[PDB]
PDB file of C-alpha atoms in Angstrom:
ATOM      1  CA  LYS H  18      11.575 -57.940  -3.714  1.00  0.00           C
ATOM      2  CA  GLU H  19      12.576 -56.633  -7.199  1.00  0.00           C
ATOM      3  CA  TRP H  20      11.023 -57.604 -10.565  1.00  0.00           C
ATOM      4  CA  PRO H  21      13.355 -56.432 -13.317  1.00  0.00           C
ATOM      5  CA  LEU H  22      12.550 -56.630 -17.060  1.00  0.00           C
ATOM      6  CA  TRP H  23      14.015 -59.431 -19.188  1.00  0.00           C
ATOM      7  CA  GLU H  24      14.235 -59.709 -22.927  1.00  0.00           C
ATOM      8  CA  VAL H  25      13.505 -63.131 -24.336  1.00  0.00           C
ATOM      9  CA  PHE H  26      14.909 -64.814 -27.461  1.00  0.00           C
ATOM     10  CA  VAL H  27      13.670 -68.229 -28.656  1.00  0.00           C
ATOM     11  CA  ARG H  28      15.077 -70.616 -31.266  1.00  0.00           C
ATOM     12  CA  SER H  29      12.497 -73.181 -32.242  1.00  0.00           C
ATOM     13  CA  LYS H  30      13.323 -76.845 -32.867  1.00  0.00           C
ATOM     14  CA  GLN H  31      12.906 -76.171 -36.643  1.00  0.00           C
ATOM     15  CA  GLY H  32      14.772 -72.805 -36.512  1.00  0.00           C
ATOM     16  CA  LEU H  33      18.391 -71.823 -37.006  1.00  0.00           C
ATOM     17  CA  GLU H  34      18.725 -68.682 -34.804  1.00  0.00           C
ATOM     18  CA  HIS H  35      17.304 -67.109 -31.639  1.00  0.00           C
ATOM     19  CA  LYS H  36      14.517 -64.601 -32.464  1.00  0.00           C
ATOM     20  CA  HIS H  37      13.427 -61.946 -29.962  1.00  0.00           C
ATOM     21  CA  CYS H  38       9.862 -62.679 -29.008  1.00  0.00           C
ATOM     22  CA  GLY H  39       9.189 -60.378 -26.064  1.00  0.00           C
ATOM     23  CA  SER H  40       9.859 -59.152 -22.561  1.00  0.00           C
ATOM     24  CA  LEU H  41       8.579 -60.046 -19.101  1.00  0.00           C
ATOM     25  CA  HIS H  42       9.334 -59.179 -15.458  1.00  0.00           C
ATOM     26  CA  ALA H  43      10.797 -61.841 -13.138  1.00  0.00           C
ATOM     27  CA  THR H  44      12.835 -61.958  -9.938  1.00  0.00           C
ATOM     28  CA  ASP H  45      15.742 -63.818 -11.550  1.00  0.00           C
ATOM     29  CA  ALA H  46      17.036 -65.514 -14.708  1.00  0.00           C
ATOM     30  CA  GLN H  47      15.596 -68.920 -13.799  1.00  0.00           C
ATOM     31  CA  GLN H  48      12.125 -67.552 -13.138  1.00  0.00           C
ATOM     32  CA  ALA H  49      12.378 -65.686 -16.422  1.00  0.00           C
ATOM     33  CA  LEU H  50      13.173 -68.981 -18.204  1.00  0.00           C
ATOM     34  CA  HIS H  51      10.218 -70.896 -16.690  1.00  0.00           C
ATOM     35  CA  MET H  52       7.852 -68.035 -17.646  1.00  0.00           C
ATOM     36  CA  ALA H  53       9.245 -67.673 -21.156  1.00  0.00           C
ATOM     37  CA  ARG H  54       8.810 -71.394 -21.721  1.00  0.00           C
ATOM     38  CA  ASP H  55       5.194 -71.347 -20.469  1.00  0.00           C
ATOM     39  CA  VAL H  56       4.107 -68.207 -22.173  1.00  0.00           C
ATOM     40  CA  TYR H  57       5.966 -68.169 -25.532  1.00  0.00           C
ATOM     41  CA  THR H  58       6.153 -71.869 -26.337  1.00  0.00           C
ATOM     42  CA  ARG H  59       3.695 -74.695 -26.159  1.00  0.00           C
ATOM     43  CA  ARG H  60       5.810 -76.954 -23.933  1.00  0.00           C
ATOM     44  CA  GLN H  61       7.568 -78.191 -27.069  1.00  0.00           C
ATOM     45  CA  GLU H  62      10.556 -80.572 -27.304  1.00  0.00           C
ATOM     46  CA  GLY H  63      13.722 -78.869 -28.568  1.00  0.00           C
ATOM     47  CA  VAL H  64      13.205 -75.138 -28.032  1.00  0.00           C
ATOM     48  CA  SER H  65      16.147 -73.050 -26.788  1.00  0.00           C
ATOM     49  CA  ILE H  66      15.315 -69.967 -24.711  1.00  0.00           C
ATOM     50  CA  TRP H  67      17.671 -67.129 -23.858  1.00  0.00           C
ATOM     51  CA  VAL H  68      16.909 -64.487 -21.218  1.00  0.00           C
ATOM     52  CA  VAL H  69      18.763 -61.157 -20.842  1.00  0.00           C
ATOM     53  CA  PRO H  70      18.122 -58.289 -18.455  1.00  0.00           C
ATOM     54  CA  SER H  71      17.082 -55.220 -20.451  1.00  0.00           C
ATOM     55  CA  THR H  72      19.785 -53.183 -18.752  1.00  0.00           C
ATOM     56  CA  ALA H  73      22.328 -55.511 -20.486  1.00  0.00           C
ATOM     57  CA  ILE H  74      21.313 -54.580 -24.068  1.00  0.00           C
ATOM     58  CA  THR H  75      22.911 -51.613 -25.876  1.00  0.00           C
ATOM     59  CA  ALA H  76      20.988 -50.453 -28.986  1.00  0.00           C
ATOM     60  CA  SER H  77      21.999 -48.500 -32.056  1.00  0.00           C
ATOM     61  CA  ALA H  78      20.784 -44.864 -32.150  1.00  0.00           C
ATOM     62  CA  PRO H  79      17.979 -43.781 -34.602  1.00  0.00           C
TER      63      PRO H  79
ATOM     64  CA  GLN X   5      46.450 -54.192 -22.838  1.00  0.00           C
ATOM     65  CA  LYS X   6      42.622 -54.013 -22.849  1.00  0.00           C
ATOM     66  CA  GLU X   7      40.029 -56.808 -22.339  1.00  0.00           C
ATOM     67  CA  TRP X   8      38.070 -57.945 -25.391  1.00  0.00           C
ATOM     68  CA  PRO X   9      35.069 -59.838 -24.059  1.00  0.00           C
ATOM     69  CA  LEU X  10      32.515 -61.688 -26.213  1.00  0.00           C
ATOM     70  CA  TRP X  11      29.291 -59.954 -27.355  1.00  0.00           C
ATOM     71  CA  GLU X  12      26.206 -61.416 -28.946  1.00  0.00           C
ATOM     72  CA  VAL X  13      24.753 -59.416 -31.817  1.00  0.00           C
ATOM     73  CA  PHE X  14      21.050 -59.211 -32.709  1.00  0.00           C
ATOM     74  CA  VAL X  15      19.776 -57.314 -35.762  1.00  0.00           C
ATOM     75  CA  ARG X  16      16.340 -56.222 -36.945  1.00  0.00           C
ATOM     76  CA  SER X  17      16.331 -55.417 -40.632  1.00  0.00           C
ATOM     77  CA  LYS X  18      14.574 -52.424 -42.269  1.00  0.00           C
ATOM     78  CA  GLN X  19      11.325 -54.204 -43.133  1.00  0.00           C
ATOM     79  CA  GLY X  20      12.004 -56.727 -40.276  1.00  0.00           C
ATOM     80  CA  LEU X  21       9.633 -57.319 -37.351  1.00  0.00           C
ATOM     81  CA  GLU X  22      11.976 -58.674 -34.654  1.00  0.00           C
ATOM     82  CA  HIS X  23      15.661 -58.795 -33.701  1.00  0.00           C
ATOM     83  CA  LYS X  24      17.366 -62.045 -34.830  1.00  0.00           C
ATOM     84  CA  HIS X  25      20.685 -63.303 -33.444  1.00  0.00           C
ATOM     85  CA  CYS X  26      23.215 -63.132 -36.254  1.00  0.00           C
ATOM     86  CA  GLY X  27      26.532 -63.959 -34.530  1.00  0.00           C
ATOM     87  CA  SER X  28      29.205 -62.966 -32.016  1.00  0.00           C
ATOM     88  CA  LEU X  29      32.226 -60.734 -31.845  1.00  0.00           C
ATOM     89  CA  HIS X  30      34.915 -59.602 -29.402  1.00  0.00           C
ATOM     90  CA  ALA X  31      35.091 -55.903 -28.493  1.00  0.00           C
ATOM     91  CA  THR X  32      36.404 -53.697 -25.701  1.00  0.00           C
ATOM     92  CA  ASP X  33      32.999 -52.116 -24.949  1.00  0.00           C
ATOM     93  CA  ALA X  34      29.386 -51.831 -26.026  1.00  0.00           C
ATOM     94  CA  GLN X  35      30.012 -48.879 -28.343  1.00  0.00           C
ATOM     95  CA  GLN X  36      32.898 -50.588 -30.135  1.00  0.00           C
ATOM     96  CA  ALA X  37      30.760 -53.740 -30.424  1.00  0.00           C
ATOM     97  CA  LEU X  38      27.974 -51.695 -32.052  1.00  0.00           C
ATOM     98  CA  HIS X  39      30.398 -50.026 -34.459  1.00  0.00           C
ATOM     99  CA  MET X  40      31.927 -53.428 -35.386  1.00  0.00           C
ATOM    100  CA  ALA X  41      28.525 -55.121 -35.746  1.00  0.00           C
ATOM    101  CA  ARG X  42      27.353 -52.223 -37.966  1.00  0.00           C
ATOM    102  CA  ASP X  43      30.254 -52.965 -40.332  1.00  0.00           C
ATOM    103  CA  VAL X  44      30.592 -56.739 -40.017  1.00  0.00           C
ATOM    104  CA  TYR X  45      26.894 -57.663 -40.105  1.00  0.00           C
ATOM    105  CA  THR X  46      24.769 -54.796 -41.462  1.00  0.00           C
ATOM    106  CA  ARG X  47      27.225 -53.134 -43.863  1.00  0.00           C
ATOM    107  CA  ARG X  48      25.840 -49.775 -42.654  1.00  0.00           C
ATOM    108  CA  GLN X  49      22.335 -50.339 -44.143  1.00  0.00           C
ATOM    109  CA  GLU X  50      19.876 -47.523 -43.321  1.00  0.00           C
ATOM    110  CA  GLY X  51      16.910 -48.495 -41.155  1.00  0.00           C
ATOM    111  CA  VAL X  52      18.424 -51.484 -39.384  1.00  0.00           C
ATOM    112  CA  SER X  53      18.411 -51.827 -35.562  1.00  0.00           C
ATOM    113  CA  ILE X  54      21.408 -53.460 -33.856  1.00  0.00           C
ATOM    114  CA  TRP X  55      21.497 -54.843 -30.294  1.00  0.00           C
ATOM    115  CA  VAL X  56      24.727 -55.933 -28.634  1.00  0.00           C
ATOM    116  CA  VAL X  57      24.848 -57.889 -25.379  1.00  0.00           C
ATOM    117  CA  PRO X  58      27.835 -59.174 -23.463  1.00  0.00           C
ATOM    118  CA  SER X  59      27.714 -62.986 -23.486  1.00  0.00           C
ATOM    119  CA  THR X  60      27.839 -63.109 -19.696  1.00  0.00           C
ATOM    120  CA  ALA X  61      24.420 -61.423 -19.612  1.00  0.00           C
ATOM    121  CA  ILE X  62      22.632 -64.332 -21.367  1.00  0.00           C
ATOM    122  CA  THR X  63      21.214 -67.271 -19.408  1.00  0.00           C
ATOM    123  CA  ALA X  64      20.212 -70.193 -21.693  1.00  0.00           C
ATOM    124  CA  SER X  65      17.773 -72.979 -20.981  1.00  0.00           C
ATOM    125  CA  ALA X  66      19.333 -76.367 -20.094  1.00  0.00           C
ATOM    126  CA  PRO X  67      19.515 -79.113 -22.818  1.00  0.00           C
TER     127      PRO X  67
ATOM    128  CA  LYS K  26      35.740 -71.413 -24.444  1.00  0.00           C
ATOM    129  CA  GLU K  27      35.599 -67.779 -23.168  1.00  0.00           C
ATOM    130  CA  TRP K  28      37.227 -66.380 -19.993  1.00  0.00           C
ATOM    131  CA  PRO K  29      35.690 -62.986 -19.282  1.00  0.00           C
ATOM    132  CA  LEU K  30      36.873 -60.617 -16.509  1.00  0.00           C
ATOM    133  CA  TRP K  31      34.956 -60.410 -13.222  1.00  0.00           C
ATOM    134  CA  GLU K  32      35.141 -57.805 -10.523  1.00  0.00           C
ATOM    135  CA  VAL K  33      35.045 -59.129  -6.992  1.00  0.00           C
ATOM    136  CA  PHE K  34      33.630 -57.514  -3.837  1.00  0.00           C
ATOM    137  CA  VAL K  35      33.992 -59.134  -0.392  1.00  0.00           C
ATOM    138  CA  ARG K  36      32.309 -58.333   2.927  1.00  0.00           C
ATOM    139  CA  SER K  37      34.159 -59.960   5.777  1.00  0.00           C
ATOM    140  CA  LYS K  38      32.417 -61.565   8.757  1.00  0.00           C
ATOM    141  CA  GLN K  39      33.481 -58.517  10.870  1.00  0.00           C
ATOM    142  CA  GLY K  40      32.643 -55.977   8.099  1.00  0.00           C
ATOM    143  CA  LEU K  41      29.543 -53.979   7.261  1.00  0.00           C
ATOM    144  CA  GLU K  42      29.836 -53.519   3.449  1.00  0.00           C
ATOM    145  CA  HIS K  43      31.231 -55.237   0.350  1.00  0.00           C
ATOM    146  CA  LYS K  44      34.695 -53.856  -0.564  1.00  0.00           C
ATOM    147  CA  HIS K  45      36.166 -54.321  -4.045  1.00  0.00           C
ATOM    148  CA  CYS K  46      39.227 -56.482  -3.706  1.00  0.00           C
ATOM    149  CA  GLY K  47      40.146 -57.372  -7.281  1.00  0.00           C
ATOM    150  CA  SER K  48      39.413 -58.960 -10.621  1.00  0.00           C
ATOM    151  CA  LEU K  49      39.939 -62.396 -12.146  1.00  0.00           C
ATOM    152  CA  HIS K  50      39.006 -64.288 -15.332  1.00  0.00           C
ATOM    153  CA  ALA K  51      36.568 -67.226 -15.149  1.00  0.00           C
ATOM    154  CA  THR K  52      34.193 -69.048 -17.482  1.00  0.00           C
ATOM    155  CA  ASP K  53      31.106 -68.218 -15.409  1.00  0.00           C
ATOM    156  CA  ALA K  54      29.796 -66.618 -12.208  1.00  0.00           C
ATOM    157  CA  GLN K  55      30.086 -69.819 -10.164  1.00  0.00           C
ATOM    158  CA  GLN K  56      33.690 -70.425 -11.166  1.00  0.00           C
ATOM    159  CA  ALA K  57      34.393 -66.798 -10.336  1.00  0.00           C
ATOM    160  CA  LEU K  58      32.930 -67.341  -6.839  1.00  0.00           C
ATOM    161  CA  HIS K  59      35.005 -70.476  -6.096  1.00  0.00           C
ATOM    162  CA  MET K  60      38.186 -68.660  -7.231  1.00  0.00           C
ATOM    163  CA  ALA K  61      37.408 -65.488  -5.300  1.00  0.00           C
ATOM    164  CA  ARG K  62      36.840 -67.530  -2.159  1.00  0.00           C
ATOM    165  CA  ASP K  63      40.133 -69.434  -2.581  1.00  0.00           C
ATOM    166  CA  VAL K  64      42.270 -66.538  -3.575  1.00  0.00           C
ATOM    167  CA  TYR K  65      40.939 -63.547  -1.570  1.00  0.00           C
ATOM    168  CA  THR K  66      39.816 -65.225   1.639  1.00  0.00           C
ATOM    169  CA  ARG K  67      41.330 -67.819   3.883  1.00  0.00           C
ATOM    170  CA  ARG K  68      38.398 -70.252   3.754  1.00  0.00           C
ATOM    171  CA  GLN K  69      36.773 -68.250   6.549  1.00  0.00           C
ATOM    172  CA  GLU K  70      33.289 -68.723   8.060  1.00  0.00           C
ATOM    173  CA  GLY K  71      30.921 -65.843   7.275  1.00  0.00           C
ATOM    174  CA  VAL K  72      32.400 -64.044   4.267  1.00  0.00           C
ATOM    175  CA  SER K  73      30.037 -62.808   1.537  1.00  0.00           C
ATOM    176  CA  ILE K  74      31.438 -62.623  -2.000  1.00  0.00           C
ATOM    177  CA  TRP K  75      29.893 -60.800  -4.937  1.00  0.00           C
ATOM    178  CA  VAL K  76      31.031 -61.280  -8.543  1.00  0.00           C
ATOM    179  CA  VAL K  77      30.163 -58.945 -11.451  1.00  0.00           C
ATOM    180  CA  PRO K  78      31.281 -59.066 -15.066  1.00  0.00           C
ATOM    181  CA  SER K  79      33.391 -55.989 -15.817  1.00  0.00           C
ATOM    182  CA  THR K  80      31.183 -55.183 -18.786  1.00  0.00           C
ATOM    183  CA  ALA K  81      28.326 -54.661 -16.246  1.00  0.00           C
ATOM    184  CA  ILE K  82      30.007 -51.762 -14.375  1.00  0.00           C
ATOM    185  CA  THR K  83      29.556 -48.138 -15.513  1.00  0.00           C
ATOM    186  CA  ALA K  84      32.106 -45.697 -14.013  1.00  0.00           C
ATOM    187  CA  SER K  85      32.087 -41.957 -13.488  1.00  0.00           C
ATOM    188  CA  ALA K  86      34.282 -39.956 -15.913  1.00  0.00           C
ATOM    189  CA  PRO K  87      37.565 -38.290 -14.690  1.00  0.00           C
TER     190      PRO K  87
ATOM    191  CA  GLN P  29       6.063 -45.299 -18.668  1.00  0.00           C
ATOM    192  CA  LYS P  30       9.754 -46.263 -18.306  1.00  0.00           C
ATOM    193  CA  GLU P  31      11.364 -49.117 -16.291  1.00  0.00           C
ATOM    194  CA  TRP P  32      13.291 -48.165 -13.156  1.00  0.00           C
ATOM    195  CA  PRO P  33      15.440 -51.167 -12.300  1.00  0.00           C
ATOM    196  CA  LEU P  34      17.617 -51.482  -9.178  1.00  0.00           C
ATOM    197  CA  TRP P  35      21.317 -50.479  -9.259  1.00  0.00           C
ATOM    198  CA  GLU P  36      24.038 -51.112  -6.732  1.00  0.00           C
ATOM    199  CA  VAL P  37      26.349 -48.184  -6.064  1.00  0.00           C
ATOM    200  CA  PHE P  38      30.040 -48.455  -5.142  1.00  0.00           C
ATOM    201  CA  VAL P  39      32.175 -45.410  -4.299  1.00  0.00           C
ATOM    202  CA  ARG P  40      35.900 -44.838  -3.858  1.00  0.00           C
ATOM    203  CA  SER P  41      36.603 -41.658  -1.953  1.00  0.00           C
ATOM    204  CA  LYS P  42      39.327 -39.092  -2.801  1.00  0.00           C
ATOM    205  CA  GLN P  43      42.021 -40.498  -0.513  1.00  0.00           C
ATOM    206  CA  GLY P  44      40.300 -43.961  -0.694  1.00  0.00           C
ATOM    207  CA  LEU P  45      42.018 -47.128  -1.939  1.00  0.00           C
ATOM    208  CA  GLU P  46      39.065 -49.273  -3.071  1.00  0.00           C
ATOM    209  CA  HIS P  47      35.407 -48.999  -4.093  1.00  0.00           C
ATOM    210  CA  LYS P  48      33.009 -49.730  -1.185  1.00  0.00           C
ATOM    211  CA  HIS P  49      29.322 -50.586  -1.626  1.00  0.00           C
ATOM    212  CA  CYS P  50      27.321 -47.721  -0.173  1.00  0.00           C
ATOM    213  CA  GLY P  51      23.715 -48.552  -1.156  1.00  0.00           C
ATOM    214  CA  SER P  52      21.137 -49.002  -3.913  1.00  0.00           C
ATOM    215  CA  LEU P  53      18.875 -46.874  -6.033  1.00  0.00           C
ATOM    216  CA  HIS P  54      16.329 -47.180  -8.845  1.00  0.00           C
ATOM    217  CA  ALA P  55      17.094 -45.475 -12.169  1.00  0.00           C
ATOM    218  CA  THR P  56      16.117 -45.752 -15.824  1.00  0.00           C
ATOM    219  CA  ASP P  57      19.706 -46.273 -17.049  1.00  0.00           C
ATOM    220  CA  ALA P  58      23.358 -46.333 -16.073  1.00  0.00           C
ATOM    221  CA  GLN P  59      23.891 -42.625 -16.732  1.00  0.00           C
ATOM    222  CA  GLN P  60      20.890 -41.575 -14.646  1.00  0.00           C
ATOM    223  CA  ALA P  61      22.067 -43.944 -11.889  1.00  0.00           C
ATOM    224  CA  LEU P  62      25.501 -42.269 -11.924  1.00  0.00           C
ATOM    225  CA  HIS P  63      23.973 -38.789 -11.818  1.00  0.00           C
ATOM    226  CA  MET P  64      21.674 -39.812  -8.914  1.00  0.00           C
ATOM    227  CA  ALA P  65      24.475 -41.573  -7.010  1.00  0.00           C
ATOM    228  CA  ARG P  66      26.690 -38.477  -7.469  1.00  0.00           C
ATOM    229  CA  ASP P  67      24.021 -36.401  -5.698  1.00  0.00           C
ATOM    230  CA  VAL P  68      22.592 -38.897  -3.211  1.00  0.00           C
ATOM    231  CA  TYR P  69      25.857 -40.458  -2.013  1.00  0.00           C
ATOM    232  CA  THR P  70      28.861 -38.278  -2.912  1.00  0.00           C
ATOM    233  CA  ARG P  71      27.299 -34.798  -2.809  1.00  0.00           C
ATOM    234  CA  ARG P  72      29.414 -33.966  -5.891  1.00  0.00           C
ATOM    235  CA  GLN P  73      32.775 -34.229  -4.033  1.00  0.00           C
ATOM    236  CA  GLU P  74      35.806 -33.759  -6.323  1.00  0.00           C
ATOM    237  CA  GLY P  75      38.077 -36.781  -6.703  1.00  0.00           C
ATOM    238  CA  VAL P  76      35.567 -39.511  -5.919  1.00  0.00           C
ATOM    239  CA  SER P  77      34.999 -42.507  -8.248  1.00  0.00           C
ATOM    240  CA  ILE P  78      31.472 -43.921  -8.592  1.00  0.00           C
ATOM    241  CA  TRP P  79      30.545 -47.350 -10.004  1.00  0.00           C
ATOM    242  CA  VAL P  80      26.956 -48.324 -10.740  1.00  0.00           C
ATOM    243  CA  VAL P  81      25.876 -51.880 -11.533  1.00  0.00           C
ATOM    244  CA  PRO P  82      22.430 -53.231 -12.270  1.00  0.00           C
ATOM    245  CA  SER P  83      21.470 -55.636  -9.469  1.00  0.00           C
ATOM    246  CA  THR P  84      20.836 -58.431 -11.954  1.00  0.00           C
ATOM    247  CA  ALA P  85      24.554 -58.404 -12.804  1.00  0.00           C
ATOM    248  CA  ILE P  86      25.652 -59.456  -9.279  1.00  0.00           C
ATOM    249  CA  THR P  87      25.921 -63.120  -8.286  1.00  0.00           C
ATOM    250  CA  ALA P  88      26.336 -63.572  -4.493  1.00  0.00           C
ATOM    251  CA  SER P  89      27.776 -66.524  -2.641  1.00  0.00           C
ATOM    252  CA  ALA P  90      25.222 -68.847  -0.975  1.00  0.00           C
ATOM    253  CA  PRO P  91      24.616 -68.535   2.838  1.00  0.00           C
TER     254      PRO P  91
END
C-alpha cells in the first residue's frame, strides 16, 4: 500500500488566500484532508484545506 | 490547436516564509505556466519562488 | 467552469492490461469516468476504466 | 533523503497502435521514471513511446 507525499494549503476563516503550511504522507486525497484538518487546524469552523500530490507541483529554478 | 488547461499559482516572496496562492492562469504546460506566472504575478523579481499546479491536481475540503 | 482533457485507459473483461483508447474533456474525474464508460464501452460487465488528466502524463522525446 | 513515489508506465511499441500499461516503478521524478522505464521495460528499443504517470493522478472505476 503506497503513502505518497502531499502538499497542504490552508485558508483560515479570517484569511483571504490559501497559504502552504506543510506536507504529509497519506494513501489518498481524502485521507490527506482528514489529517491536514486534524494536524494543522484546531477543528475550526470555516477553514478551507487544499491537498496536492508533490509530484503535481512544478517549481521555478534557483 | 493546443489545450490550455487551468493552473493555480503559488508564490513565496524574497523575504517570505511560505508560498501563498495568488491566482490562476491558462497555459499549455507547466513551463509556460511558470514563465507566464513570472511575468503576470512576480514581474521577474529576484529571490521569489513560484509554484504552478494544474487545477485538476487540487482536492479541496467540502463546504 | 473548466473542462480539462483526460486520457482514458480501458481493460476489458477478457483483457490483461489497460489500453489507451482516447481522450475527452470533462469537469472532473468522475464525469470523465461516466463518459468513458458510455462512449468507449457498451455498458459491459467487468470493464475497468482509468482516467488521467493530460497534464499528468510525461512522454518520451522523439 | 528524497521521496520515491509510485509511477504507472504505459508503452506504445514501434509498430504499435496504442499505449498499453506494462507495470509500475518508484522514482524521484518524471524524468527519472522515464529513464528507468526506458531501461526496465523497453530495453532502449528505437521507435517506442513511453508515458509515465504518478499513481496519484489515476482515478479508477469502482468494482
